């Protein structure tokens, strides 16, 4: 925080996704690649926004520390971004709850559904006894 500066380039506007996309660079001369959570608040405060509609990813520092490149993602609202945002980032910072079974059990269940013919009761029952 004492010697950590955030710079931005390729700054562009689009209410297309009611959002603004710009690639960023961070200076951390005597420390590791900085975590995202506090620099999110940094971008929020120097654009006078809340540190929650701010999304950012893809931090790859260069050789020997120093500059780290990442793509910042600012938006207009939590809900507007909620409509159009990939789910994985919404699960990184917990805002979209992600919990489903692994693909193997789902495929097995699908094969069980295609096994039982037509009737809803046996079909919906094809996961009760095949639990």
């Amino acid at each position: 925080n004492d010697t950590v500066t955030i710079r931005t380039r390729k700054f562009m506007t689009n209410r297309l996704l009611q959002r603004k996309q710009m690639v960023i660079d961070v200076l951390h001369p005597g420390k590791a690649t900085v975590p995202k959570t506090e620099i999110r608040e940094k971008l929020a405060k120097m654009y006078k926004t809340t540190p929650d509609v701010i999304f950012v990813f893809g931090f790859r520092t260069h050789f020997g520390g120093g500059k780290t490149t990442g793509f910042g993602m600012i938006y207009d609202s939590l809900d507007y971004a909620k409509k159009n945002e990939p789910k994985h980032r919404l699960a990184r910072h917990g805002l979209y709850e992600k919990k489903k079974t692994s693909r193997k059990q789902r495929k097995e269940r699908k094969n069980r559904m295609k096994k039982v013919r037509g009737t809803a009761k046996a079909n919906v029952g094809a996961g009760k006894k095949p639990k």
């Binding site: 001369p29 005597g30 260069h62 050789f63 020997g64 520390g65 120093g66």
Partner: protein
């Protein structure tokens, strides 16, 4: 199917005639007074020289006033001088034939780190390169085969992290310091 490339070429070629004493002595001179690790690098720089000589040759046979000739000759001369091997006034497609391998080796960063005076005993210079201590204008580079350019010669300096520029003394510095400080109060 797969999104890979499988693109790669050997940077070196072996000599065709093995166990020839004179070439052995010559390459040994080069490795000794240029501090390389193995003759693979010598062959690799020789192979680079051979490629550029082939290009220059197939230019020379091509008739002058040809726009490809002028264009690619300009590009070749400009890249070679931008590296720093050839004099700027030396501006014709022929002297590159007269050029040899030693000035190519001079562009290896392991030798300007010597020539500017910061690193004596060129082997010490190379180990300093592998030490991640030298820093190009804004970046720390650890490759003893770096080929520098004109616009890079004056911007070679120690890294701030190295215990020769900025602070953070090395680990044995800390070892000796705390060992000495532990014996008294």
């Amino acid at each position: 199917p797969v999104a890979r490339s499988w693109v790669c070429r050997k940077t070196y070629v072996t000599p065709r005639r093995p166990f020839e004493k004179s070439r052995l002595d010559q390459e040994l001179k080069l490795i000794g007074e240029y501090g390389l690790r193995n003759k693979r690098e010598v062959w690799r720089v020789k192979f680079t020289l051979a490629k550029i000589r082939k290009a220059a040759r197939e230019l020379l046979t091509l008739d002058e006033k040809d726009p490809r000739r002028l264009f690619e000759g300009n590009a070749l001369l400009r890249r070679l001088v931008r590296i720093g091997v050839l004099d700027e006034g030396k501006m014709k497609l022929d002297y590159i034939l007269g050029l040899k391998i030693e000035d190519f080796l001079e562009r290896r960063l392991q030798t300007q780190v010597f020539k500017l005076g910061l690193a004596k005993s060129i082997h010490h210079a190379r180990v300093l390169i592998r030490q991640r201590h030298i820093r190009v204008r804004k970046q720390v580079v650890n490759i003893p085969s770096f080929i520098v350019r004109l616009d890079s010669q004056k911007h070679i300096d120690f890294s701030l992290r190295s215990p020769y520029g900025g602070g953070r003394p090395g680990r044995v510095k800390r070892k000796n310091a705390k060992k000495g400080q532990g014996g008294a109060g």
